[PDB]
Coordinates of C-alpha atoms and ligand atoms in Angstrom, one line a residue:
Chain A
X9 CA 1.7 -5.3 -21.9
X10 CA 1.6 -3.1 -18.6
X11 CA 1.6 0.7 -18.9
X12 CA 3.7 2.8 -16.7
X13 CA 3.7 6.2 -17.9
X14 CA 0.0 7.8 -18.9
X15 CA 1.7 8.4 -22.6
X16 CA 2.0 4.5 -23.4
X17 CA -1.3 4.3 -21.7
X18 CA -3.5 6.2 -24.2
X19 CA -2.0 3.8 -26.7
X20 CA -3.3 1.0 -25.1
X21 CA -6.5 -1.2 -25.7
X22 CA -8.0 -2.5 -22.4
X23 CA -9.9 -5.6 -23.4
X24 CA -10.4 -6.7 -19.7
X25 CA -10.8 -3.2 -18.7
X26 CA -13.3 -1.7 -20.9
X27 CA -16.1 -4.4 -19.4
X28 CA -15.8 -2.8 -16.2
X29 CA -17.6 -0.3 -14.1
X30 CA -14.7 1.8 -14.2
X31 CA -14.3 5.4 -16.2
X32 CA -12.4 5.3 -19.4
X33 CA -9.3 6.6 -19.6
X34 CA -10.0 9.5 -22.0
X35 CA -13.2 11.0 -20.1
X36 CA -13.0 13.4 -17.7
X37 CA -15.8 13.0 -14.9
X38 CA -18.0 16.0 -14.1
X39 CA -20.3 13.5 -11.4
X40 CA -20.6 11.7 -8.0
X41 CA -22.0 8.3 -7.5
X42 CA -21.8 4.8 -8.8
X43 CA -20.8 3.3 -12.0
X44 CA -23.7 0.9 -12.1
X45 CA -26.5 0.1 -9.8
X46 CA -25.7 -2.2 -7.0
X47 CA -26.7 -6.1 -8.8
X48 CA -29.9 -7.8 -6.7
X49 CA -28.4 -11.1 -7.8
X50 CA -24.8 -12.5 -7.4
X51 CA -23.3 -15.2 -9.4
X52 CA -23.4 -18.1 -7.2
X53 CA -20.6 -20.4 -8.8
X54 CA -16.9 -19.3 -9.3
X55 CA -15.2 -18.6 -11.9
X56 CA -13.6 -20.4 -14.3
X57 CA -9.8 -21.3 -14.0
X58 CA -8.0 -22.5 -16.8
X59 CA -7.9 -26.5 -17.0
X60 CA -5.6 -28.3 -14.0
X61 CA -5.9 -25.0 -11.7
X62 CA -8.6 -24.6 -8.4
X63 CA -9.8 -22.0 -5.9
X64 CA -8.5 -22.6 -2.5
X65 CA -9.6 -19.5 0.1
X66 CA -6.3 -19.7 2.4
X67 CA -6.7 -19.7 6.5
X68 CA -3.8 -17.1 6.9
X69 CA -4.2 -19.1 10.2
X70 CA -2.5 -22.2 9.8
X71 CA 1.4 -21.0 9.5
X72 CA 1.9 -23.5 6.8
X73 CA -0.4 -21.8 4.2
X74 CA 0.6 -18.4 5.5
X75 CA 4.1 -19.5 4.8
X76 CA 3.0 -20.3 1.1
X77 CA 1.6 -17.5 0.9
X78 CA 4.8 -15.7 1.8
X79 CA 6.8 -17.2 -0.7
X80 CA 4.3 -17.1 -3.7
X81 CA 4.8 -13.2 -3.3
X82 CA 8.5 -13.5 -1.9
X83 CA 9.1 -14.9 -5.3
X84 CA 6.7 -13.4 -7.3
X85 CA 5.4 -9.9 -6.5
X86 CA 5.8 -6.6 -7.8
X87 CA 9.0 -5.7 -8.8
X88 CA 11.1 -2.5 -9.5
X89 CA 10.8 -1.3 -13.1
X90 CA 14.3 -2.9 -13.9
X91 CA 14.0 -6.4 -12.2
X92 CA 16.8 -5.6 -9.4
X93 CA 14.4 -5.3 -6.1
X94 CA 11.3 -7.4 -4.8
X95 CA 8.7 -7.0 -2.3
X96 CA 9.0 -9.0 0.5
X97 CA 6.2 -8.8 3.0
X98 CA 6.9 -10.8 6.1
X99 CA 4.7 -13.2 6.8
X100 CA 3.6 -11.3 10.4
X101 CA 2.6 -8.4 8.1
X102 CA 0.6 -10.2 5.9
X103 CA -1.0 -11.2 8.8
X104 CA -1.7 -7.6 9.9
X105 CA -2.3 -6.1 6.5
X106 CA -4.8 -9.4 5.8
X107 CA -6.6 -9.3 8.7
X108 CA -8.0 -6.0 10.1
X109 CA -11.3 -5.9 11.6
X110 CA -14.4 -7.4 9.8
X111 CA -11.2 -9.8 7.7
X112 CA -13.3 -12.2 6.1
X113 CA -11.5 -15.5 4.6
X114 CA -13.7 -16.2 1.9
X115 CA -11.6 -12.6 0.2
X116 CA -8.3 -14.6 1.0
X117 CA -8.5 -15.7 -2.6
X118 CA -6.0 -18.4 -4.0
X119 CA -5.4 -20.0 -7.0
X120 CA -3.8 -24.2 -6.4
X121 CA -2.0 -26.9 -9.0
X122 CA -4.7 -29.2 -8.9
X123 CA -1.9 -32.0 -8.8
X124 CA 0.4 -30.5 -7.0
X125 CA -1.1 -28.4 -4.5
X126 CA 1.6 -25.2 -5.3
X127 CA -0.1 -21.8 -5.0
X128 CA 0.1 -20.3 -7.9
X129 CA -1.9 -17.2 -7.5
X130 CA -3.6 -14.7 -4.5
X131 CA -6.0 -11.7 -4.7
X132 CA -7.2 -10.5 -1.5
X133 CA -10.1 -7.9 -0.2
X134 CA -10.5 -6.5 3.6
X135 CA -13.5 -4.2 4.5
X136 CA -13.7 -0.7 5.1
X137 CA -15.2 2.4 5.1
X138 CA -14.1 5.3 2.4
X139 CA -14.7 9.1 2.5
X140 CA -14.5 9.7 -0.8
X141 CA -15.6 13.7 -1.3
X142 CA -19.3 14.5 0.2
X143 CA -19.6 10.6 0.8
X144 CA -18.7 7.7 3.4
X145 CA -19.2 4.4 1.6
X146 CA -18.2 0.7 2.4
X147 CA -15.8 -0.3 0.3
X148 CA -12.8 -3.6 0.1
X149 CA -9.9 -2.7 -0.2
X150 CA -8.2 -4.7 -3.0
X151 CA -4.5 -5.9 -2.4
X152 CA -2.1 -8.7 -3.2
X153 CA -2.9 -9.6 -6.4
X154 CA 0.1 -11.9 -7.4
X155 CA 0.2 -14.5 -10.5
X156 CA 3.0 -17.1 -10.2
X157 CA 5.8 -15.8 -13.2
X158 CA 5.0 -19.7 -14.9
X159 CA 1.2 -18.5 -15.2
X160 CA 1.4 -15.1 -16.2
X161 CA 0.0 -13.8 -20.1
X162 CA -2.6 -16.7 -19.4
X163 CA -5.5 -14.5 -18.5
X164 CA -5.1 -15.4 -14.9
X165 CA -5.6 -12.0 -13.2
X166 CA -8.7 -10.9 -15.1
X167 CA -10.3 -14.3 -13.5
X168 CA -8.7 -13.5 -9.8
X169 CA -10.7 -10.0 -10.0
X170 CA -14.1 -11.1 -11.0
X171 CA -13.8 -13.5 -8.7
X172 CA -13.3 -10.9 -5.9
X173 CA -15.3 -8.9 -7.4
X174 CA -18.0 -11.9 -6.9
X175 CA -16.9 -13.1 -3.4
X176 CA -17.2 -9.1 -2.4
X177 CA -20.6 -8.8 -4.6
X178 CA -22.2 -11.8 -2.2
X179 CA -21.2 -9.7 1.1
X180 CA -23.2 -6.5 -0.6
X181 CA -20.3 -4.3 -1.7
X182 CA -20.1 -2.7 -4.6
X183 CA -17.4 -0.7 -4.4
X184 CA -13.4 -1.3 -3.6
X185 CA -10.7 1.6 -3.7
X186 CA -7.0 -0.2 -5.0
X187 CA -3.7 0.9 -5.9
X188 CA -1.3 -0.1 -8.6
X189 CA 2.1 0.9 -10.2
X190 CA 0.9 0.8 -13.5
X191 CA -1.8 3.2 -15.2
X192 CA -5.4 1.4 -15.5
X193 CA -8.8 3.2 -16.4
X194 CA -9.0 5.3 -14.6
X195 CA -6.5 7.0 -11.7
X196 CA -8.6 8.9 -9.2
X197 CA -5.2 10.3 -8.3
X198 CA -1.6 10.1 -9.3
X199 CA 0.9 9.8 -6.5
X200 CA 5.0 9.9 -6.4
X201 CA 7.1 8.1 -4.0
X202 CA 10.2 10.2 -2.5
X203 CA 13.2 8.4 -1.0
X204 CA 15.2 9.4 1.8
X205 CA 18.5 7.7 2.1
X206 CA 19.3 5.9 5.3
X207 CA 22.4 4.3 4.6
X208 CA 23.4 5.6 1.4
X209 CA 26.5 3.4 1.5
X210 CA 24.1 0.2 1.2
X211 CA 22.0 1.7 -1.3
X212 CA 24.2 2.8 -3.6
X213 CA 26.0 -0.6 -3.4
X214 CA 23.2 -2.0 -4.4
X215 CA 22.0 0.6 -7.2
X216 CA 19.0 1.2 -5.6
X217 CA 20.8 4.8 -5.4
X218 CA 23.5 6.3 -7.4
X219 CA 25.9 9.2 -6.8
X220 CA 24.2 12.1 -7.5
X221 CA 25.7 14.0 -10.7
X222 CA 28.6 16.3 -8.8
X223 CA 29.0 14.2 -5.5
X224 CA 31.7 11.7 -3.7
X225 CA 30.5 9.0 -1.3
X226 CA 31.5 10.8 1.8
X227 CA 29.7 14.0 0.7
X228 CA 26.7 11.6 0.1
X229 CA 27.1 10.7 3.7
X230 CA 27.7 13.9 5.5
X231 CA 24.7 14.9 3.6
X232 CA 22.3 12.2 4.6
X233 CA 23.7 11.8 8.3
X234 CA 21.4 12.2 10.8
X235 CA 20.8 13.3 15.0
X236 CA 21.4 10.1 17.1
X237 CA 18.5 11.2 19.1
X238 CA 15.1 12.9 18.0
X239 CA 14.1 15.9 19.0
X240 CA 10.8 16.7 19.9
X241 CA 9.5 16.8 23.7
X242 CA 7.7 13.9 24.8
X243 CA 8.4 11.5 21.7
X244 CA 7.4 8.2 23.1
X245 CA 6.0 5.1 21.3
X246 CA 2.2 4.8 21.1
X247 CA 0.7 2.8 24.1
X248 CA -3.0 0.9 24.7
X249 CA -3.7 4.4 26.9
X250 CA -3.3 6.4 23.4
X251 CA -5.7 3.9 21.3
X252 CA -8.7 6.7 21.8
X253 CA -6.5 9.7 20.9
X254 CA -5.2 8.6 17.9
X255 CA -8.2 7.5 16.7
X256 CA -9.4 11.2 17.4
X257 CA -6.6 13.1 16.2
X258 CA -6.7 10.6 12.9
X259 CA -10.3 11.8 12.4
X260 CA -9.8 15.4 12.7
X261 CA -6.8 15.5 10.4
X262 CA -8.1 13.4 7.5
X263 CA -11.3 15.8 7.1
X264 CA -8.9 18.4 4.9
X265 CA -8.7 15.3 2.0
X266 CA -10.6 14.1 -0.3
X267 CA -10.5 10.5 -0.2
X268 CA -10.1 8.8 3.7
X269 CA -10.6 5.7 5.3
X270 CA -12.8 6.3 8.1
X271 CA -11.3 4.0 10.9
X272 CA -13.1 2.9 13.7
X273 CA -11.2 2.5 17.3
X274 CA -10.3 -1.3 16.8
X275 CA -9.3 -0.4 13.5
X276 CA -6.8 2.2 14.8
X277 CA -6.1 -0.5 17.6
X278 CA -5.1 -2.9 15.0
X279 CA -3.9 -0.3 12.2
X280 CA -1.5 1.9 14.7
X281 CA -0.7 -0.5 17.7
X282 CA 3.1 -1.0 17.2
X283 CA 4.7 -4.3 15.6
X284 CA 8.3 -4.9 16.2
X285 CA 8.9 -5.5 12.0
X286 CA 5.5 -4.3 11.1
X287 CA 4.2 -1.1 12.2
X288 CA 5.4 1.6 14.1
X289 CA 3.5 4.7 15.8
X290 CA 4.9 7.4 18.2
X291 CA 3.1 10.0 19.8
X292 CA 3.9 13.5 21.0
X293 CA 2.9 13.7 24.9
X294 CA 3.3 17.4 26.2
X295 CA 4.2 19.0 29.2
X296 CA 0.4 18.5 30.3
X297 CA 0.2 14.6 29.8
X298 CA -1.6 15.4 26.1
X299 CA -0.9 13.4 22.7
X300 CA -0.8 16.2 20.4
X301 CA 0.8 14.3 17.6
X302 CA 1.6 11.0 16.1
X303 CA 3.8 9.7 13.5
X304 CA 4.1 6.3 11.8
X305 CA 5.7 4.1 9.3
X306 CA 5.3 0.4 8.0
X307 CA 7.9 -1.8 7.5
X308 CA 8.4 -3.1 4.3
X309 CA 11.3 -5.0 3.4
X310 CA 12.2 -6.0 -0.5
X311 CA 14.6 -8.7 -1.6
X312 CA 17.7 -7.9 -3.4
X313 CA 17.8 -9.9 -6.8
X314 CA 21.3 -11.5 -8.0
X315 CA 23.5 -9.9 -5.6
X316 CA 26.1 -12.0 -4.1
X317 CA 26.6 -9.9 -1.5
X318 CA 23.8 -7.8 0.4
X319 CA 20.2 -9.6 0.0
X320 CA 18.5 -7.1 1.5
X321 CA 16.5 -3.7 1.7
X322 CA 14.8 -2.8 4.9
X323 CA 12.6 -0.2 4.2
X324 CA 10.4 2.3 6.2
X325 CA 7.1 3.4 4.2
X326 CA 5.6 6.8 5.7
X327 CA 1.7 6.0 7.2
X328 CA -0.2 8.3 8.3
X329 CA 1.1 11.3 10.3
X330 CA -0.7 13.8 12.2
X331 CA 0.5 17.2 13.2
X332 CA -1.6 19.6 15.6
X333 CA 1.0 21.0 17.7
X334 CA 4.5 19.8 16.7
X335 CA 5.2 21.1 12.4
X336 CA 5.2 18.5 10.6
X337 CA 8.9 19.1 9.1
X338 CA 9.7 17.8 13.0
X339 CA 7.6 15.2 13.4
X340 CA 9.7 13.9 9.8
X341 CA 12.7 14.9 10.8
X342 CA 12.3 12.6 14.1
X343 CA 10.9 9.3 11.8
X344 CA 13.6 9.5 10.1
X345 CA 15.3 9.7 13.1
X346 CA 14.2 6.7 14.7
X347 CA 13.6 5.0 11.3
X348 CA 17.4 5.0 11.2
X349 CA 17.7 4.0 14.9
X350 CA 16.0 1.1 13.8
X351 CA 18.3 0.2 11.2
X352 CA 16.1 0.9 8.0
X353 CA 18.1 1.6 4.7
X354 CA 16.1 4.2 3.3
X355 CA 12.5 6.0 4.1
X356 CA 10.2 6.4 1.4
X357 CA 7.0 8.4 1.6
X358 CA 4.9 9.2 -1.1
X359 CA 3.7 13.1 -2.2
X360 CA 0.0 13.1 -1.0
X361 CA -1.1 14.8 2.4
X362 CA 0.8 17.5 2.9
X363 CA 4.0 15.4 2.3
X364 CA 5.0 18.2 -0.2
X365 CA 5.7 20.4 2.4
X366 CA 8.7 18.3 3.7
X367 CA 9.5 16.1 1.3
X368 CA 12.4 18.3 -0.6
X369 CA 13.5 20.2 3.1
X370 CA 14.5 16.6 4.6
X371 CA 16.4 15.6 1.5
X372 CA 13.6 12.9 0.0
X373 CA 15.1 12.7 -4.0
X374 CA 12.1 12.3 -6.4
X375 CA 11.7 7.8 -7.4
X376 CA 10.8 6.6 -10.5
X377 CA 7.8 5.1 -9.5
X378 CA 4.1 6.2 -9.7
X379 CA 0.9 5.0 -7.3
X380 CA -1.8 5.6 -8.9
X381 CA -5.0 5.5 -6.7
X382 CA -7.9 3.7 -7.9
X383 CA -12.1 3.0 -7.5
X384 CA -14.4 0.7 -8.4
X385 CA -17.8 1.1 -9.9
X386 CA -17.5 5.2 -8.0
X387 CA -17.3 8.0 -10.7
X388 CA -15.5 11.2 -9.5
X389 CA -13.5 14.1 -10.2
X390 CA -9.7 13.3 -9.9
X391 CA -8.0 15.0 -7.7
X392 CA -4.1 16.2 -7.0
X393 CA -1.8 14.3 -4.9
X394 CA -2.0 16.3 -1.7
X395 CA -5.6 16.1 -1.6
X396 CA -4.9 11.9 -1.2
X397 CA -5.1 11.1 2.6
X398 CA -5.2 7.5 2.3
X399 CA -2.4 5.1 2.7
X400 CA -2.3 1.4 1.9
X401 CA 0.3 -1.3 2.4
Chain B
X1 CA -1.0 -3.5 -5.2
X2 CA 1.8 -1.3 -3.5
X3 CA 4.4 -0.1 -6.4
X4 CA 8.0 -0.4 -5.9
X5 CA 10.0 2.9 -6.7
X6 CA 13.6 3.5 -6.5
X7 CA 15.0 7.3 -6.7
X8 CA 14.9 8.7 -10.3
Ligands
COA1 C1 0.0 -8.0 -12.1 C2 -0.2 -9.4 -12.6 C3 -1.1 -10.2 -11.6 C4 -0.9 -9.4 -13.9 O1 -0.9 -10.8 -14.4 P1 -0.4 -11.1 -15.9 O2 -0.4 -12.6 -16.1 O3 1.0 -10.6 -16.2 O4 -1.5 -10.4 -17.1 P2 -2.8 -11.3 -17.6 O5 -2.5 -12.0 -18.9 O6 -3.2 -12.3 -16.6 O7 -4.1 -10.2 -17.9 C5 -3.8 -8.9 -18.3 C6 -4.9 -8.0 -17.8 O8 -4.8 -7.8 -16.5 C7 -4.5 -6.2 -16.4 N1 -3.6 -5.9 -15.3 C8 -2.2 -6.0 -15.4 N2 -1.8 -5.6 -14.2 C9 -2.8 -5.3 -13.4 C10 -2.9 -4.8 -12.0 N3 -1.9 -4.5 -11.0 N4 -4.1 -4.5 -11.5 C11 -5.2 -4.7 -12.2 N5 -5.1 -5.2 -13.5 C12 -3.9 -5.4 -14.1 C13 -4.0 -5.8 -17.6 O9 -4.3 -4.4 -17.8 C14 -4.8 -6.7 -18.6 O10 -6.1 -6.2 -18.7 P3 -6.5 -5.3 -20.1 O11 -6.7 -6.3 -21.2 O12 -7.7 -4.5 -19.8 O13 -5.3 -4.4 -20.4 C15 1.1 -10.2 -12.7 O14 1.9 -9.5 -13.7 C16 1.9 -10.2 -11.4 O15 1.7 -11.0 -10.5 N6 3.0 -9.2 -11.3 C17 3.8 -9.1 -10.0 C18 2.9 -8.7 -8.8 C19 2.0 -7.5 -9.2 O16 2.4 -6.7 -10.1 N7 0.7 -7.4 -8.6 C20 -0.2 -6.3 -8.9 C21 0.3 -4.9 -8.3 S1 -0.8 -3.5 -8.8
MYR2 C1 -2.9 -4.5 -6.0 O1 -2.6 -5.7 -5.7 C2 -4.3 -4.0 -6.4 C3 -4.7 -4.8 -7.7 C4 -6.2 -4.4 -7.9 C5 -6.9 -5.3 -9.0 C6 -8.2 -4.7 -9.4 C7 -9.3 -4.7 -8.3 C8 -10.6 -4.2 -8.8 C9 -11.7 -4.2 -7.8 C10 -12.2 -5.6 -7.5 C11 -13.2 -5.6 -6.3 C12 -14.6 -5.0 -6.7 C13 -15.5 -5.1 -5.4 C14 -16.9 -4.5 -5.7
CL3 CL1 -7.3 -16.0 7.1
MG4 MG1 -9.5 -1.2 8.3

């Protein structure tokens, strides 16, 4: 029994919850720090999995398991709130998203069929290092957790986080920032994702859209249609020559937020570098041979459920964009731009940063879906959307 | 985990 809305959440008991360092939901927090002292001794021995079910840390690797991988949360991932669209993470971005600098594959946590060898269940962790307020802490970053549909209501996930939570424990990290759709003790922050139609003719097809309440199709279309070109000077995709820039221009930017990742340079390498299908990054060279600027967007594609016809959703999720010279209304109006160029359905960015400020003036239309912005054993005032400068996959 | 949203 998943919560959605905060409402259903206040009627909710949270039997795994409530024996974690976490905040309850009701309390307000007026402090800083941890929830608990770091532990000087870490349980040695996993946990317990239900009888016929083992542990099996997966070498992303070997293409075979990266492959199972793929198709544990091809078929069983996080879904839409009416069961009509899946994620459906390739497995070259798994790759990327599961291996960063520092990736460790002990937090490449899977759950096996004794007999039969079928993953059944994933949680994974990857390092790094959080500005959260007045502090810079390393965290994990918690992602991925999937239970196979056939092994769900069986307590599964609870045993898939304290086994993180161990396997992180034993590396000496004690806290982990995570993300979910659904409302947990307790959000640090509440964020909205915004859509901006690509190819409104697909997504309405499909019902990811519908005609909006006074419109016909090929008003829909004029409305959403687009430059063939973007506009701003010097738009070029980010090179090995801009790794140093990026990384500096990323720094400067995020100071205005509240809760950061602090990247180092590989991480921007790895985290910016473009990925035909993964990741993409452009920056704005001027007139003196300068990156001012740099957008980017992941690609994230989901799987269209029962439809005999189109199978398929590409979509573009906003990343991290930084504005010192070019507004940023440009530098949104050119993703999309080139998101479309690339033959994305729709663009979706959430309402943190200063997404606000363009959001509604490039036609994004409000989703139905939350992401609500987590911590781990780190008490702190919650804060409002645009005051959320961190993005995760 | 990410959270899959679909215009309201
Ligand atoms: C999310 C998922 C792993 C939960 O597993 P489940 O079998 O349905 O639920 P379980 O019986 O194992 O245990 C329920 C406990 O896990 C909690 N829980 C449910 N979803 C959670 C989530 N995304 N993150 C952390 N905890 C979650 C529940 O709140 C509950 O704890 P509580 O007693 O304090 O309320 C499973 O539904 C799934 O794989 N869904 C599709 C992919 C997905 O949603 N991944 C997580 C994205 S945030
Ligand atoms: C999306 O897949 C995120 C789901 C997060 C599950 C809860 C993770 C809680 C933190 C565990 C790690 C703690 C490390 C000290
Ligand atoms: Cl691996
Ligand atoms: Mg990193």
């Amino acid at each position: 029994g998943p919560a959605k809305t905060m409402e259903e959440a206040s009627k909710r008991s949270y039997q795994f919850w409530d024996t974690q360092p976490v905040p309850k939901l009701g309390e307000v927090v007026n402090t800083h720090g941890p929830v608990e002292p770091d532990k000087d001794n870490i349980r040695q021995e996993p946990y317990t999995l239900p009888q016929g079910f083992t542990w099996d840390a997966l070498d992303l690797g070997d293409r075979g398991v990266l492959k199972e991988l793929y198709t544990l949360l091809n078929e069983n991932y996080v879904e839409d709130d009416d069961n009509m669209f899946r994620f459906d993470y390739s497995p070259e971005f798994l790759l990327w998203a599961l291996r960063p600098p520092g990736w460790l594959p002990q937090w490449h946590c899977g759950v096996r069929v004794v007999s039969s060898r079928k993953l059944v269940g994933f949680i994974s962790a990857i390092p790094a290092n959080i500005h959260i307020y007045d502090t810079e802490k390393k965290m994990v970053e918690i992602n991925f957790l999937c239970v196979h549909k056939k092994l769900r209501s069986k307590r599964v996930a609870p045993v898939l986080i304290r086994e993180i939570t161990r396997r992180v424990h034993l590396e000496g990290i004690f806290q982990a920032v995570y993300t979910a759709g659904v409302v947990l003790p307790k959000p640090v922050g509440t964020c909205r994702y915004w859509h901006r139609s690509l190819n409104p003719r697909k997504l309405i097809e499909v019902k990811f859209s519908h005609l909006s309440r006074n419109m016909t199709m090929q008003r829909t279309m004029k409305l959403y249609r687009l430059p063939e070109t973007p506009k701003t000077a010097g738009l070029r995709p980010m090179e090995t020559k801009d790794i140093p820039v990026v990384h500096q221009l990323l720094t400067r930017y995020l100071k205005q937020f509240h809760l950061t990742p602090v990247m180092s340079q590989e991480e921007v390498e790895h985290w910016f570098y473009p990925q035909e299908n993964i990741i993409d990054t452009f920056v704005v060279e001027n007139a003196n041979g300068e990156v001012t600027d740099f957008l980017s967007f992941y690609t994230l594609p989901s799987t269209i459920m029962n439809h005999p016809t189109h199978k398929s959703l590409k979509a573009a999720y906003s990343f991290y964009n930084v504005h010192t010279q070019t507004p940023l209304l440009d530098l949104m109006s050119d993703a999309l731009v080139l998101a479309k160029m690339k033959g994305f359905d729709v663009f979706n960015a959430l309402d943190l940063m200063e997404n606000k400020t363009f959001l509604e003036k490039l036609k994004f239309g409000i989703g139905d879906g939350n992401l609500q912005y987590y911590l781990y054993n780190w008490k702190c005032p919650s804060m409002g959307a645009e005051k959320v400068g961190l993005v995760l996959q | 985990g990410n959270c899959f949203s679909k215009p309201r």
